[PDB]
Amino acid sequence: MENFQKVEKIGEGTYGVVYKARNKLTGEVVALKKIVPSTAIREISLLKELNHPNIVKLLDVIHTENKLYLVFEFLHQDLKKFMDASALTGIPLPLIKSYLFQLLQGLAFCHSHRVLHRDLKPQNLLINTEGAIKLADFGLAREVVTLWYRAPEILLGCKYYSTAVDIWSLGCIFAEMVTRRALFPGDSEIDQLFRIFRTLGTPDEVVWPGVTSMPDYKPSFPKWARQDFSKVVPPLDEDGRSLLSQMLHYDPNKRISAKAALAHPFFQDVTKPVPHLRL
Ligand SMILES: CCc1cnn2c(NCc3cnc(N)nc3)cc(-c3c(F)cccc3F)nc12
């Protein structure tokens, strides 16, 4: 740690404070996360090899005094702040599309290595001036923690959920970029589930075989009808609405994979615009 100079506290991650810091030697500017069971150590050390342009680079892992510091590449802004900043006019579709495409590439990569994020949210999607967007805190899962982006199988008590949970989260984030409002802003586990049900309809054995057998499923759940996506994410075009609908399929087995999503017609005209960032 004596190797780093703390510049400022950039936020409170799930495990500790995240700082912007400077390597007292190389002058390198980095993000320093202060998080030790040996299981964690080997899992985190594994992340050092999970390198991709759309995954925030983990530079080094430092274990000292029974303390754990993660040294990451630094990015100046996150999607939450950017969305807040683009509130009045909304993020341009071409930029939304580029961000979604890059994030799907990042997930396709992690998923191909059987690594799940598990907790995607605007706060951990980091952006730069070059128009890039990156997944942060990847694999760290394996203040109130937000449930807004939680997949229904997690809420229903599925213990062995899949890569599909990240697809669900990204779909929620995609909708939020488009409409400028959170899709399912639940403030409790039941409120989150019920918000999902009210929009996508209460799931049953027809749309999701095996759902009624999930640990936290209750036959007493109210039965709401499904809403049209045309009402949910106007004025997203049919290609975007088709893609969104697949990313939000109830049955995780039917939910589109990151790889298949990258082939969707929505991305036929994808480009990489530069966002206007004010640092
Ligand atoms: C450690 C890798 C990491 C590298 N940059 N960065 C950022 N950067 C964006 C940023 C920069 N300055 C300010 N002031 N605010 C945001 C945020 C978080 C992060 C966090 F700080 C809290 C929760 C989740 C996160 F991803 N983690 C990181």
Tab-separated table of C-alpha atoms and ligand atoms in Angstrom:
chain	number	residue	atom	x	y	z
A	1	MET	CA	0.000	0.000	0.000
A	2	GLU	CA	2.836	2.438	0.749
A	3	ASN	CA	3.347	2.276	-3.019
A	4	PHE	CA	0.153	4.272	-3.613
A	5	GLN	CA	-1.008	7.819	-3.014
A	6	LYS	CA	-4.756	8.145	-2.498
A	7	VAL	CA	-6.099	10.957	-4.669
A	8	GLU	CA	-9.759	10.723	-3.821
A	9	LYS	CA	-12.549	8.383	-2.786
A	10	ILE	CA	-14.433	7.577	-5.991
A	11	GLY	CA	-17.144	5.551	-4.355
A	12	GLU	CA	-18.226	2.852	-1.986
A	13	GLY	CA	-18.182	-0.481	-3.743
A	14	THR	CA	-19.952	-3.494	-2.258
A	15	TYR	CA	-16.796	-4.642	-0.452
A	16	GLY	CA	-15.047	-1.420	0.395
A	17	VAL	CA	-14.175	2.064	-0.624
A	18	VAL	CA	-12.728	2.562	-4.089
A	19	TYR	CA	-10.048	5.203	-4.436
A	20	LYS	CA	-8.405	6.981	-7.304
A	21	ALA	CA	-4.710	6.598	-6.608
A	22	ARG	CA	-1.247	7.198	-7.942
A	23	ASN	CA	1.601	4.694	-8.000
A	24	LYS	CA	4.256	6.598	-6.071
A	25	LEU	CA	6.809	5.105	-8.437
A	26	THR	CA	5.574	4.713	-12.029
A	27	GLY	CA	3.225	7.685	-11.633
A	28	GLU	CA	0.480	5.366	-12.957
A	29	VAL	CA	-3.040	6.494	-12.033
A	30	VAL	CA	-5.261	3.636	-10.921
A	31	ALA	CA	-8.391	2.695	-9.032
A	32	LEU	CA	-7.554	1.062	-5.711
A	33	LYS	CA	-10.219	-1.113	-4.116
A	34	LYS	CA	-9.876	-1.995	-0.424
A	35	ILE	CA	-11.728	-5.262	0.187
A	36	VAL	CA	-8.542	-13.098	3.914
A	37	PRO	CA	-9.974	-16.548	3.196
A	38	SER	CA	-7.713	-18.464	0.804
A	39	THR	CA	-10.713	-19.284	-1.381
A	40	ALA	CA	-11.166	-15.616	-2.190
A	41	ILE	CA	-7.457	-15.260	-2.963
A	42	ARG	CA	-7.375	-17.991	-5.614
A	43	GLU	CA	-10.641	-16.812	-7.180
A	44	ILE	CA	-9.470	-13.224	-7.380
A	45	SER	CA	-6.047	-14.247	-8.663
A	46	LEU	CA	-7.980	-16.026	-11.415
A	47	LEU	CA	-9.509	-12.734	-12.480
A	48	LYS	CA	-6.083	-11.311	-13.319
A	49	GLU	CA	-6.099	-13.558	-16.400
A	50	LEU	CA	-9.664	-12.724	-17.504
A	51	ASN	CA	-8.550	-9.919	-19.849
A	52	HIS	CA	-10.797	-8.244	-22.443
A	53	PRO	CA	-11.133	-4.692	-23.819
A	54	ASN	CA	-14.616	-4.395	-22.284
A	55	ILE	CA	-13.606	-5.634	-18.836
A	56	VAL	CA	-11.885	-3.188	-16.448
A	57	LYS	CA	-8.310	-4.483	-16.191
A	58	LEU	CA	-7.270	-5.892	-12.816
A	59	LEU	CA	-3.593	-4.861	-12.625
A	60	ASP	CA	-2.560	-6.414	-9.369
A	61	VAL	CA	-3.757	-8.074	-6.214
A	62	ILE	CA	-2.125	-7.004	-2.962
A	63	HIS	CA	-2.544	-9.027	0.227
A	64	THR	CA	-0.963	-7.486	3.340
A	65	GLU	CA	-1.568	-7.361	7.099
A	66	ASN	CA	-4.400	-9.720	6.315
A	67	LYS	CA	-5.747	-6.944	4.095
A	68	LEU	CA	-6.701	-7.132	0.405
A	69	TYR	CA	-6.189	-4.370	-2.175
A	70	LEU	CA	-7.217	-4.655	-5.770
A	71	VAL	CA	-5.412	-2.416	-8.234
A	72	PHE	CA	-7.457	-1.686	-11.341
A	73	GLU	CA	-7.212	0.407	-14.475
A	74	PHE	CA	-8.883	3.767	-13.797
A	75	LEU	CA	-11.902	5.060	-15.799
A	76	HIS	CA	-13.193	8.563	-15.215
A	77	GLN	CA	-16.922	7.986	-15.266
A	78	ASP	CA	-19.660	5.383	-14.828
A	79	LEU	CA	-22.929	4.864	-16.762
A	80	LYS	CA	-25.101	5.986	-13.861
A	81	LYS	CA	-23.511	9.432	-13.760
A	82	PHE	CA	-23.543	9.594	-17.559
A	83	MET	CA	-27.234	8.722	-17.708
A	84	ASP	CA	-27.909	11.347	-15.038
A	85	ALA	CA	-25.924	13.795	-17.192
A	86	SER	CA	-27.848	12.878	-20.353
A	87	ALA	CA	-31.191	13.111	-18.579
A	88	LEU	CA	-32.607	16.154	-20.394
A	89	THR	CA	-31.981	14.844	-23.910
A	90	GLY	CA	-31.286	11.144	-23.426
A	91	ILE	CA	-28.299	9.135	-24.639
A	92	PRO	CA	-28.394	8.973	-28.456
A	93	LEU	CA	-29.579	5.601	-29.771
A	94	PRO	CA	-26.373	5.004	-31.747
A	95	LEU	CA	-24.395	5.418	-28.472
A	96	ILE	CA	-26.849	3.230	-26.533
A	97	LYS	CA	-26.471	0.612	-29.251
A	98	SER	CA	-22.678	0.826	-29.188
A	99	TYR	CA	-22.604	0.468	-25.386
A	100	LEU	CA	-24.927	-2.519	-25.414
A	101	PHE	CA	-22.875	-4.200	-28.181
A	102	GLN	CA	-19.587	-3.744	-26.276
A	103	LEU	CA	-21.119	-5.000	-23.027
A	104	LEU	CA	-22.452	-8.062	-24.821
A	105	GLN	CA	-18.912	-8.702	-26.163
A	106	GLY	CA	-17.554	-8.416	-22.615
A	107	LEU	CA	-20.215	-10.827	-21.284
A	108	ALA	CA	-19.712	-13.217	-24.221
A	109	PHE	CA	-16.030	-13.374	-23.206
A	110	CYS	CA	-16.580	-13.860	-19.462
A	111	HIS	CA	-19.363	-16.359	-20.057
A	112	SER	CA	-17.153	-18.354	-22.443
A	113	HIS	CA	-14.813	-18.725	-19.468
A	114	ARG	CA	-17.699	-19.715	-17.249
A	115	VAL	CA	-17.349	-16.546	-15.208
A	116	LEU	CA	-20.472	-14.664	-14.175
A	117	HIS	CA	-20.689	-11.050	-13.104
A	118	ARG	CA	-23.874	-11.503	-10.992
A	119	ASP	CA	-24.323	-7.849	-10.111
A	120	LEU	CA	-24.387	-5.694	-13.235
A	121	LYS	CA	-25.641	-2.169	-12.659
A	122	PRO	CA	-25.013	1.292	-14.142
A	123	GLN	CA	-22.630	2.118	-11.301
A	124	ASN	CA	-20.255	-0.648	-12.380
A	125	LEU	CA	-20.324	0.023	-16.128
A	126	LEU	CA	-17.425	2.414	-16.714
A	127	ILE	CA	-16.841	4.643	-19.698
A	128	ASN	CA	-13.993	6.585	-21.290
A	129	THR	CA	-13.552	9.387	-23.813
A	130	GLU	CA	-12.801	6.896	-26.608
A	131	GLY	CA	-16.410	5.695	-26.611
A	132	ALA	CA	-15.539	2.467	-24.768
A	133	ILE	CA	-17.605	0.944	-21.979
A	134	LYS	CA	-16.299	-1.683	-19.542
A	135	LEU	CA	-17.669	-4.157	-16.989
A	136	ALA	CA	-16.264	-3.463	-13.500
A	137	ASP	CA	-16.145	-5.703	-10.436
A	138	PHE	CA	-16.415	-8.737	-12.690
A	139	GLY	CA	-16.275	-12.040	-10.785
A	140	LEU	CA	-15.992	-10.376	-7.370
A	141	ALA	CA	-19.374	-11.855	-6.370
A	142	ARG	CA	-18.313	-15.513	-6.540
A	143	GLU	CA	-25.623	1.197	1.865
A	144	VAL	CA	-28.471	-0.894	0.471
A	145	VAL	CA	-27.429	-3.147	-2.409
A	146	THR	CA	-29.741	-2.479	-5.328
A	147	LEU	CA	-32.128	-5.187	-6.494
A	148	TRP	CA	-33.246	-3.314	-9.625
A	149	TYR	CA	-31.264	-5.473	-11.980
A	150	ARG	CA	-31.714	-8.845	-10.272
A	151	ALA	CA	-32.891	-11.740	-12.424
A	152	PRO	CA	-36.181	-13.384	-11.336
A	153	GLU	CA	-34.569	-16.823	-10.852
A	154	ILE	CA	-32.290	-15.286	-8.199
A	155	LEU	CA	-35.305	-13.632	-6.502
A	156	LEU	CA	-37.162	-16.973	-6.584
A	157	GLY	CA	-34.333	-18.739	-4.774
A	158	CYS	CA	-32.550	-20.583	-7.590
A	159	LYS	CA	-29.191	-21.455	-5.992
A	160	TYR	CA	-27.393	-22.443	-9.154
A	161	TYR	CA	-28.291	-19.664	-11.525
A	162	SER	CA	-26.513	-19.201	-14.820
A	163	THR	CA	-24.878	-16.723	-17.136
A	164	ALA	CA	-28.458	-15.788	-18.058
A	165	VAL	CA	-28.622	-13.603	-14.923
A	166	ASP	CA	-26.155	-11.160	-16.507
A	167	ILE	CA	-28.235	-11.035	-19.701
A	168	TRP	CA	-31.292	-10.079	-17.633
A	169	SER	CA	-29.385	-7.307	-15.844
A	170	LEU	CA	-28.067	-5.876	-19.121
A	171	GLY	CA	-31.576	-5.955	-20.583
A	172	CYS	CA	-32.811	-3.884	-17.627
A	173	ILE	CA	-29.925	-1.446	-18.165
A	174	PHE	CA	-30.676	-1.282	-21.972
A	175	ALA	CA	-34.338	-0.320	-21.194
A	176	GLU	CA	-33.173	2.297	-18.674
A	177	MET	CA	-30.845	3.941	-21.203
A	178	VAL	CA	-33.669	4.138	-23.678
A	179	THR	CA	-36.449	5.437	-21.417
A	180	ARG	CA	-34.368	7.406	-18.915
A	181	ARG	CA	-36.019	5.671	-16.004
A	182	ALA	CA	-35.194	2.442	-14.157
A	183	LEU	CA	-37.229	-0.448	-15.528
A	184	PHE	CA	-37.929	-2.282	-12.223
A	185	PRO	CA	-36.914	-0.038	-9.277
A	186	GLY	CA	-37.876	-2.453	-6.478
A	187	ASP	CA	-37.154	-1.531	-2.877
A	188	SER	CA	-37.489	-5.008	-1.409
A	189	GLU	CA	-37.247	-8.539	-2.775
A	190	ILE	CA	-41.032	-8.947	-3.053
A	191	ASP	CA	-41.429	-5.445	-4.486
A	192	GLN	CA	-38.769	-6.222	-7.077
A	193	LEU	CA	-40.468	-9.498	-8.063
A	194	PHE	CA	-43.909	-7.897	-8.184
A	195	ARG	CA	-42.625	-5.028	-10.341
A	196	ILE	CA	-41.294	-7.586	-12.793
A	197	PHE	CA	-44.607	-9.528	-12.711
A	198	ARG	CA	-46.686	-6.371	-13.281
A	199	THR	CA	-44.803	-5.659	-16.477
A	200	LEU	CA	-43.947	-9.074	-17.874
A	201	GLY	CA	-46.917	-10.893	-16.351
A	202	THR	CA	-46.831	-13.327	-13.441
A	203	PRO	CA	-44.830	-16.325	-14.692
A	204	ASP	CA	-46.479	-19.757	-14.815
A	205	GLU	CA	-45.649	-23.206	-16.082
A	206	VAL	CA	-46.585	-22.154	-19.601
A	207	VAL	CA	-43.885	-19.510	-20.086
A	208	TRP	CA	-41.425	-20.935	-17.538
A	209	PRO	CA	-41.558	-24.732	-16.936
A	210	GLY	CA	-40.480	-25.536	-13.378
A	211	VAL	CA	-41.160	-22.032	-12.007
A	212	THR	CA	-43.841	-23.135	-9.546
A	213	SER	CA	-41.291	-25.483	-7.974
A	214	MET	CA	-38.735	-22.796	-7.181
A	215	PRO	CA	-37.891	-22.361	-3.504
A	216	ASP	CA	-39.416	-18.911	-3.044
A	217	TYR	CA	-42.295	-19.270	-5.450
A	218	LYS	CA	-45.730	-18.958	-3.819
A	219	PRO	CA	-49.000	-19.991	-5.397
A	220	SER	CA	-50.470	-16.976	-3.658
A	221	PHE	CA	-48.534	-14.545	-5.952
A	222	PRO	CA	-51.056	-12.195	-7.619
A	223	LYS	CA	-51.630	-12.985	-11.296
A	224	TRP	CA	-50.910	-9.961	-13.475
A	225	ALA	CA	-51.150	-9.907	-17.259
A	226	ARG	CA	-48.182	-9.124	-19.483
A	227	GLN	CA	-47.697	-5.621	-20.951
A	228	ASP	CA	-46.616	-4.905	-24.560
A	229	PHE	CA	-43.015	-3.813	-25.001
A	230	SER	CA	-44.373	-1.024	-27.138
A	231	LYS	CA	-45.685	0.426	-23.851
A	232	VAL	CA	-42.549	-0.488	-21.884
A	233	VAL	CA	-39.712	1.035	-23.924
A	234	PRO	CA	-41.202	3.498	-26.383
A	235	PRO	CA	-39.995	4.624	-28.679
A	236	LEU	CA	-37.432	1.866	-29.174
A	237	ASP	CA	-37.660	0.362	-32.679
A	238	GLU	CA	-38.891	-3.178	-33.402
A	239	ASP	CA	-35.364	-4.622	-33.638
A	240	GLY	CA	-34.472	-3.206	-30.200
A	241	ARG	CA	-37.792	-4.284	-28.703
A	242	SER	CA	-37.346	-7.805	-30.151
A	243	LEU	CA	-33.850	-8.005	-28.627
A	244	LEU	CA	-34.970	-6.628	-25.287
A	245	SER	CA	-37.846	-9.141	-25.152
A	246	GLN	CA	-35.382	-11.996	-25.580
A	247	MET	CA	-32.966	-10.668	-22.926
A	248	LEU	CA	-35.932	-10.512	-20.541
A	249	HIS	CA	-37.367	-13.997	-21.183
A	250	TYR	CA	-38.485	-15.535	-17.861
A	251	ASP	CA	-37.005	-18.986	-18.475
A	252	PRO	CA	-33.223	-18.597	-18.132
A	253	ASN	CA	-32.848	-21.460	-20.582
A	254	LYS	CA	-34.687	-19.530	-23.237
A	255	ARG	CA	-33.091	-16.161	-22.471
A	256	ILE	CA	-30.819	-15.103	-25.318
A	257	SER	CA	-27.085	-15.690	-24.792
A	258	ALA	CA	-24.576	-12.826	-25.146
A	259	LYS	CA	-23.143	-14.519	-28.238
A	260	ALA	CA	-26.554	-14.890	-29.944
A	261	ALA	CA	-27.500	-11.362	-28.941
A	262	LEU	CA	-24.406	-10.036	-30.770
A	263	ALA	CA	-25.867	-11.550	-33.983
A	264	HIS	CA	-29.253	-9.878	-33.556
A	265	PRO	CA	-30.463	-7.592	-36.417
A	266	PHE	CA	-30.444	-4.649	-33.970
A	267	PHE	CA	-26.655	-4.513	-34.338
A	268	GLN	CA	-26.616	-4.601	-38.126
A	269	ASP	CA	-25.899	-0.838	-38.227
A	270	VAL	CA	-23.856	-0.606	-35.029
A	271	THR	CA	-21.173	2.103	-34.837
A	272	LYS	CA	-18.889	3.554	-32.167
A	273	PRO	CA	-19.723	7.175	-31.468
A	274	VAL	CA	-17.782	9.306	-29.022
A	275	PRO	CA	-19.716	10.446	-25.994
A	276	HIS	CA	-19.361	13.986	-24.819
A	277	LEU	CA	-17.776	13.566	-21.429
A	278	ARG	CA	-17.099	16.433	-19.059
A	279	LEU	CA	-14.280	15.460	-16.691
B	1	LIG	C1	-12.034	-0.613	-9.158
B	1	LIG	C2	-12.147	-0.523	-10.669
B	1	LIG	C3	-12.568	0.825	-11.125
B	1	LIG	C4	-11.908	1.687	-12.048
B	1	LIG	N1	-12.555	2.842	-12.234
B	1	LIG	N2	-13.676	2.726	-11.437
B	1	LIG	C5	-14.737	3.660	-11.317
B	1	LIG	N3	-14.655	4.807	-12.094
B	1	LIG	C6	-15.694	5.750	-12.455
B	1	LIG	C7	-15.704	6.906	-11.526
B	1	LIG	C8	-14.620	7.759	-11.358
B	1	LIG	N4	-14.610	8.791	-10.503
B	1	LIG	C9	-15.716	8.955	-9.760
B	1	LIG	N5	-15.723	9.974	-8.868
B	1	LIG	N6	-16.817	8.185	-9.831
B	1	LIG	C10	-16.779	7.167	-10.711
B	1	LIG	C11	-15.744	3.364	-10.462
B	1	LIG	C12	-15.689	2.040	-9.774
B	1	LIG	C13	-16.839	1.715	-8.898
B	1	LIG	C14	-17.109	2.398	-7.713
B	1	LIG	F1	-16.323	3.408	-7.301
B	1	LIG	C15	-18.212	2.059	-6.913
B	1	LIG	C16	-19.050	1.012	-7.293
B	1	LIG	C17	-18.785	0.315	-8.473
B	1	LIG	C18	-17.695	0.681	-9.269
B	1	LIG	F2	-17.486	-0.010	-10.379
B	1	LIG	N7	-14.742	1.172	-9.914
B	1	LIG	C19	-13.707	1.515	-10.755
